[PDB]
């Protein structure tokens, strides 16, 4: 119904901190919810949730509401929270003395920990009631609250300290930049790989068997540009998974699929060349068209058994508190695995291809200077392994360290290393498609 400028600022405050959903969803304990955390019912009936929603909105929503309708529900929750604050002898004196911006910070805390929870901050509250902003900020920065949710606590505390919305303005700008940056990464992956796939598809002289292996690489790198990297970017710019527990588990398995198919194909290409460059005449008398396709179908078969089988069977799940907290939270899509899956998948996806590629490309060049007595072939070796190593080894070292000592690998670092590997899907078409009949092919496609 009736909205205000103060009303709307609190709304946009918590859309950043908690998120907005215009369709009915489930909360951490399975209850139907909509808007910004508005509980519809505890009943295990979607139609029951819809009737409660329709009575509250005043329209036949069928589970789908608008933003303005979400603010109607939200301002009712704010009204209720304020109404209980004034009934609380611990919170009413502080609330009565605060300006509108800092009242929003206090309401934000109540939405996160409950009225009773926030009323336990008696010393911070005394300091806020006396307008001792910097002392209250220091004190709040030592809280259990701060150590549990550092990012949200920093934004709320900044709001208390300054009485401005600067923390939330800085978040919107940060995300918007990462949105453009990752949107660029997405299309470099897509364009570079869709350009390779059709160049093979329509040019008759590019159907070699070494290029038969390359378009399996480019197609594994293409699914990642279309499905894995985009939905991976929503987690970074929003701090949450927005697409439900089921798509979390499907997205996760598609991620480990494409990366397993991609890296193992780099391994097949690695030995393919060797087998073709050291003994070319045996090579053709050994690798038929069926055998070449036999390898790629095996790679994708191995990749499926590393990705969809164990993840859908829940063979990967850890058994700790943050493991179970994330499994119950449909907004958390962290890949909290156990030690055996973390190690087994890393060996199949990355470690055995790394050391096979390291061995193959090494024997290529020792048997090169066995006849010269050049480095334009060494520097090609240098980057084929150099780019592949810098993109994926930082992540799988951190992956195995985290699998033994969780506290050593912070999430930020862990997510950055994974994005280094994501960038390899854009680097590979640049690396493995530089033949004169690739170069002359791409020119023909875009002219």
């Amino acid at each position, epitope marked *: 119904d009736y909205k205000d400028d103060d009303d709307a600022n609190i709304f946009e405050m918590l859309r950043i901190d908690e998120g907005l959903r215009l369709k009915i969803y489930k909360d951490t304990e399975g209850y139907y919810t909509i808007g910004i955390g508005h509980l519809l019912t505890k009943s295990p009936s979607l139609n029951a949730a819809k009737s409660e929603l329709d009575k509250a909105i005043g329209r036949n929503t069928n589970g789908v509401i608008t933003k303005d309708e979400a603010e109607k529900l939200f301002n009712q929750d704010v009204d209720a929270a304020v109404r209980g604050i004034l009934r609380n002898a611990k919170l009413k004196p502080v609330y009565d003395s605060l300006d509108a911006v800092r009242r929003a910070a206090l309401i934000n805390m109540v939405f996160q920990m409950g009225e009773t929870g926030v009323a336990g901050f008696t010393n911070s509250l005394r300091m806020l009631q006396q307008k001792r902003w910097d002392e209250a900020a220091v004190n709040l920065a030592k809280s259990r609250w701060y150590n549990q949710t550092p990012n949200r606590a920093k934004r709320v505390i900044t709001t208390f300290r300054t009485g401005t919305w600067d923390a939330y303005a800085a978040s919107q700008q940060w995300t918007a930049g990462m949105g453009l940056l990752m949107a660029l990464i997405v299309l470099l992956i897509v364009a570079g790989n869709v350009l390779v796939i059709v160049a093979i598809a329509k040019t008759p002289r590019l159907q070699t068997l*070494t290029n038969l292996f*390359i378009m399996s690489l480019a197609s594994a790198d293409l699914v990642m540009g279309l499905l894995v990297v985009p939905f991976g970017a929503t987690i970074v710019v929003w701090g949450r998974w927005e697409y439900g527990s089921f798509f979390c588990e499907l997205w996760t398995s598609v991620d480990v699929l494409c990366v397993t198919a991609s890296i193992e194909t780099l391994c097949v*290409i690695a030995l393919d*060349r060797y087998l073709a*460059i*050291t*003994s*070319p*005449f*045996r090579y053709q008398s050994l690798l038929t068209r069926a055998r070449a396709r036999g390898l790629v179908c095996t790679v994708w078969a191995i990749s499926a058994l590393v990705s969809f089988l164990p993840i859908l069977m829940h063979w990967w799940r850890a058994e700790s508190d943050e493991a179970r907290r994330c499994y119950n939270d449909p907004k958390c899509c962290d890949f909290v695995t156990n030690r055996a899956y973390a190690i087994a998948s890393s060996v199949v996806s990355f470690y055995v291809p790394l050391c096979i590629m390291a061995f193959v*490309y090494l024997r*290529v060049f020792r*048997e*090169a*200077q*066995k*006849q*010269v007595k*050049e480095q*334009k*072939a060494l520097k*090609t*070796l240098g980057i*084929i392994m150099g780019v592949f190593t810098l993109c994926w080894l930082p992540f799988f070292l951190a992956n195995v360290v985290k699998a033994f000592h969780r506290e050593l690998v912070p999430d930020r670092l862990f997510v950055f290393f994974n994005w280094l590997g994501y960038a390899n899907s854009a680097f590979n078409p640049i690396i*493995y*498609c*530089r*033949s*004169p*009949d*690739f170069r002359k092919a791409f020119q023909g496609l875009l002219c």
Partner: nanobody
Amino acid sequence: QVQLQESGGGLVQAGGSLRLSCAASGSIFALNIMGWYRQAPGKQRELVAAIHSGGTTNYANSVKGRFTISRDNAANTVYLQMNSLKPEDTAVYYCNVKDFGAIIYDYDYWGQGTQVTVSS
């Protein structure tokens, strides 16, 4: 920066002998394949004999050892001995080298050709 220089052609009667010489001027990568290709009018291009820098060779099936290809290490030069020649061998012969400096794909240098015609 690297060109193939080829010699040894001409005309000979049936059951004759020639030795071909192909010098690969300039420096190129150490793993490679030197070989020979021919194409008669009407027919289309065809391998006859190739040799790898390690030593592995491969002859066509129009050659029952009558032709023997061989390199000469320390020199980018491959030779092809043509013995027991039949009138079916009239074709322009081409010297080819498979360069492997780029590791993902082949690089092909071509000699321009030497005519070979045989009479019965």
